[PDB]
Amino acid sequence: MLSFQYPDVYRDETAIQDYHGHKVCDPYAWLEDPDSEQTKAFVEAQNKITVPFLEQCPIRGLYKERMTELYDYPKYSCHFKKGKRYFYFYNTGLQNQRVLYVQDSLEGEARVFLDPNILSDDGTVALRGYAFSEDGEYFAYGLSASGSDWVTIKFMKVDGAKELPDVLERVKFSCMAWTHDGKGMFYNAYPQQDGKSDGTETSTNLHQKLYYHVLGTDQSEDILCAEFPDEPKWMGGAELSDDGRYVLLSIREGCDPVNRLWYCDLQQESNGITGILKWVKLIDNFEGEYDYVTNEGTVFTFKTNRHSPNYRLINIDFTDPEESKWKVLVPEHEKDVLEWVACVRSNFLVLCYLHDVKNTLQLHDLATGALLKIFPLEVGSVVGYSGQKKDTEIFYQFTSFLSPGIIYHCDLTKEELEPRVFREVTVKGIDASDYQTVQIFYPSKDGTKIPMFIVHKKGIKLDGSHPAFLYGYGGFNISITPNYSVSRLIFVRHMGGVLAVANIRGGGEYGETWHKGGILANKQNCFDDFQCAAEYLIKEGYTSPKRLTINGGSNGGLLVATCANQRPDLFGCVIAQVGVMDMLKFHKYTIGHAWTTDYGCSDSKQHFEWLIKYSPLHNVKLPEADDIQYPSMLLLTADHDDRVVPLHSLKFIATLQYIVGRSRKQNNPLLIHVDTKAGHGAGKPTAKVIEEVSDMFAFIARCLNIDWIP
Ligand SMILES: *[C@@H](N)[C@@H]1CCCN1C(=O)[C@@H]1C[C@H](n2cc(CNC(=O)OC(C)(C)C)nn2)CN1C(=O)CCCc1ccccc1
């Protein structure tokens, strides 16, 4: 099967670092330089073996054809009103980028407002963030190129879709918040740095500042409103209160759901926004999250996890701000996580809960917190919403494993509420009645019950004969909830597979306690949980190790890579997308310093001792047993992934190929593909998405020798 040779890759045997008395050799450290001829040549040599391997068998083209056909369905966002007009996103089916439309009424003719497709030949310029002025007459939007986190902000006048001269550079991880006087907008920027800032660099991002841009001026005139020069990792994002009176500053340091919350009463500024604002440091620590919902005068409603790991709503009165005085508007639930909250039609709240990994949606009274109405939903996720305080209606979008999506609408001016289907699309070719979704709870090593969704064809025999695709993430308070994936349903229908999603610890599925169960000293719980999900699928007869593929991205790429090292006997195939692989060095690059809240940092002996045990780069080892080799492995990354710098995958693949790939018993391939004009994934154009899933499933099909089922 392996009619190629791995490229020769220089080992710098002098690259040795002492970590608290533990010597670590890093012979591929040179791959950390993305601009070197050595690194470029490495990437070319790797792509030269991977691409023909993936393209060789007709199955890739069969998959690509079916993906192109089945993914070709109309895709809408929720409608949202801004000022006098309605907006929505829409993709006719296979456009590289969805397009923003505008209409003067719900019943009126729609026209194109912003079409990112016309900004590049290949769909590699994408919208990344936007904000309308409070009156809806002006529009700011971020553009990213080739999938980088870097943003350029541009501006338009809404009436006539007129491009304006204003351009803001050096924007990354930024807020966008207009003052209600319409004069200008808050945003974030980084100071100038040596080298490139295009997404190919690895330079750490520090000293983010908060600026205010006056519309009709040059960026060089922008006002500095907040900075933290003694705290280079702090990031202060601004929003205006719903009445326009207060700027709320949420300061973050790291990825934990916590923030400082300062405010500026804009009426108290001596002469408008002229410099550093008169911040009042309401919550001046990182002990809890305070997410603004709405205010009525000085009474501010926040969603919080302060002493409430499943989240709750509190009211803080700025005129009586001591914690003993806060009112608990909607108390914490014993098990269900309050995921997000919105205020609509002045005095309603819309609360979205997660109940055993499925969403529910409720309308409550702002004054008392009392439940008023349950919006009925099938089992799945709410993935879109609109309805702000001054608006009188809501839209929300529902999705599930088997359903592409339904957008509902509810007119909240009516005495009796009747939510109605507003938009629905059906994908022909995937008959949902042929399949089922089950949720089970399996015990992990330590006895904790972990949820898992399993999607499969109705009536299958549990005889271990089916290929399986088991997905996980496990970190950062991210909940892995049901979603419609044509790419995975093709695996089910056309490759006879079983899909599984394990809700392992580190995620947000059971609130902050679930997240803390998968971080820092307890990160190994993630891996144990995931290995146990695989063991369940095998024991219960869904699959067998040789037919099992595991997949994850980013922190989920770390997940599957670590699992490959720890239990190579459990998996036939491993696809790690944009994975964090070097756990000793991740904090040195771009925004990686922010991840130490989930991982720790190797500068601490205590943390090093956790990290060294599971770091994928540092745990590649030939299996002791003669009959065990590594699973087939494919790493996918891209040359502008400035979220997870691609050196992680480059150094990992070099290590896998040298330590394991050179062994006579290893016959499963260990490959990397590095894409061009792409990044971590957000904003990836449709064409590239289709190529990527075609690569993934062709790899699975060839390695496992799975026949296509037309
Ligand atoms: C990928 N997981 C990378 C590497 C490890 C952490 N990480 C982040 O991007 C990190 C965690 C938060 N995050 C996770 C994701 C992943 N989403 C996802 O893949 O889920 C599916 C939809 C596929 C199921 N996206 N964001 C935030 N993130 C950051 O690094 C944010 C940087 C900016 C920032 C913002 C606020 C505070 C600090 C830093």
Side-chain angles (χ1 to χ4, degrees), residues 341-362:
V341 180
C343 176
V344 63
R345 204 218 69 174
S346 297
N347 64 342
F348 284 148
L349 296 173
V350 170
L351 306 214
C352 181
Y353 283 96
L354 204 63
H355 173 75
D356 290 326
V357 208
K358 306 154 264 145
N359 282 136
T360 57
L361 202 300
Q362 306 190 342

Side-chain angles (χ1 to χ4, degrees), residues 33-61:
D33 182 3
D35 294 313
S36 71
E37 296 302 316
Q38 295 91 327
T39 296
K40 288 178 183 147
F42 172 93
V43 167
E44 178 74 344
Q46 293 295 346
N47 278 345
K48 178 176 197 220
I49 62 161
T50 298
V51 174
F53 183 87
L54 296 173
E55 296 183 338
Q56 168 165 120
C57 288
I59 193 136
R60 190 181 183 280

Side-chain angles (χ1 to χ4, degrees), residues 155-172:
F155 290 80
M156 296 162 72
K157 184 168 85 152
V158 174
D159 180 29
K162 301 309 299 211
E163 322 250 67
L164 299 174
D166 308 64
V167 173
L168 314 172
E169 304 286 12
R170 303 217 42 85
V171 180
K172 195 194 242 204

Side-chain angles (χ1 to χ4, degrees), residues 330-406:
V330 176
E332 190 195 7
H333 193 271
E334 171 159 23
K335 194 163 113 304
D336 298 348
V337 177
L338 181 58
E339 285 209 308
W340 53 264
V341 180
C343 176
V344 63
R345 204 218 69 174
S346 297
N347 64 342
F348 284 148
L349 296 173
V350 170
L351 306 214
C352 181
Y353 283 96
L354 204 63
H355 173 75
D356 290 326
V357 208
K358 306 154 264 145
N359 282 136
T360 57
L361 202 300
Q362 306 190 342
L363 193 76
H364 292 242
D365 174 54
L366 171 64
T368 61
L371 171 62
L372 300 173
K373 180 72 171 174
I374 295 162
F375 299 112
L377 293 168
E378 299 289 347
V379 330
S381 304
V382 172
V383 296
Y385 166 87
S386 75
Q388 53 199 121
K389 198 180 178 81
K390 296 192 187 71
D391 294 339
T392 58
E393 69 203 317
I394 59 171
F395 294 81
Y396 48 99
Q397 179 159 227
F398 172 84
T399 191
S400 67
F401 289 112
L402 300 176
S403 194
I406 305 154

Side-chain angles (χ1 to χ4, degrees), residues 219-396:
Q219 182 175 25
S220 65
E221 309 179 54
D222 292 0
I223 308 296
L224 175 70
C225 292
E227 62 171 350
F228 324 99
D230 291 328
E231 291 290 3
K233 296 190 300 198
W234 288 16
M235 298 166 74
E239 69 193 310
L240 279 294
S241 60
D242 292 337
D243 59 15
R245 171 98 169 257
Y246 300 86
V247 187
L248 305 180
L249 186 67
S250 296
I251 302 168
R252 304 272 190 186
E253 184 181 44
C255 284
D256 272 340
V258 299
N259 57 283
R260 298 194 177 214
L261 197 291
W262 300 353
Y263 70 84
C264 175
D265 174 354
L266 288 168
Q267 174 223 80
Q268 289 290 300
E269 290 293 312
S270 293
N271 180 42
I273 298 169
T274 64
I276 303 295
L277 305 179
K278 291 179 205 192
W279 298 113
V280 177
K281 305 185 183 181
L282 177 78
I283 307 291
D284 198 32
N285 55 65
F286 294 120
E287 302 170 28
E289 153 197 289
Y290 300 86
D291 181 349
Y292 176 73
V293 182
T294 191
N295 67 292
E296 288 293 342
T298 59
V299 179
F300 275 68
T301 300
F302 293 98
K303 180 177 65 75
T304 190
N305 54 21
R306 167 73 158 188
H307 297 295
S308 51
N310 294 331
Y311 296 79
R312 72 185 189 164
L313 294 179
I314 54 167
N315 282 353
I316 299 170
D317 189 335
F318 289 180
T319 73
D320 193 30
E322 284 178 306
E323 187 174 7
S324 67
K325 300 312 293 291
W326 304 348
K327 302 311 184 218
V328 182
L329 184 66
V330 176
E332 190 195 7
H333 193 271
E334 171 159 23
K335 194 163 113 304
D336 298 348
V337 177
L338 181 58
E339 285 209 308
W340 53 264
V341 180
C343 176
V344 63
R345 204 218 69 174
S346 297
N347 64 342
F348 284 148
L349 296 173
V350 170
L351 306 214
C352 181
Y353 283 96
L354 204 63
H355 173 75
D356 290 326
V357 208
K358 306 154 264 145
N359 282 136
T360 57
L361 202 300
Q362 306 190 342
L363 193 76
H364 292 242
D365 174 54
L366 171 64
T368 61
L371 171 62
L372 300 173
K373 180 72 171 174
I374 295 162
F375 299 112
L377 293 168
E378 299 289 347
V379 330
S381 304
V382 172
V383 296
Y385 166 87
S386 75
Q388 53 199 121
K389 198 180 178 81
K390 296 192 187 71
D391 294 339
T392 58
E393 69 203 317
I394 59 171
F395 294 81
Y396 48 99

Side-chain angles (χ1 to χ4, degrees), residues 149 172-174 190 208 233 235 251-256 258 471 473 475-481 483 553-558 577-580 586 591-595 597-599 643-644 680:
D149 281 323
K172 195 194 242 204
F173 311 129
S174 176
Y190 283 92
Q208 196 201 51
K233 296 190 300 198
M235 298 166 74
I251 302 168
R252 304 272 190 186
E253 184 181 44
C255 284
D256 272 340
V258 299
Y471 182 88
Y473 182 79
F476 300 92
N477 194 48
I478 300 299
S479 296
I480 315 296
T481 59
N483 64 281
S554 196
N555 174 66
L558 158 66
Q577 292 168 269
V578 296
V580 189
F586 73 82
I591 197 52
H593 63 77
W595 314 331
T597 52
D598 257 46
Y599 300 148
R643 185 68 64 84
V644 178
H680 197 53

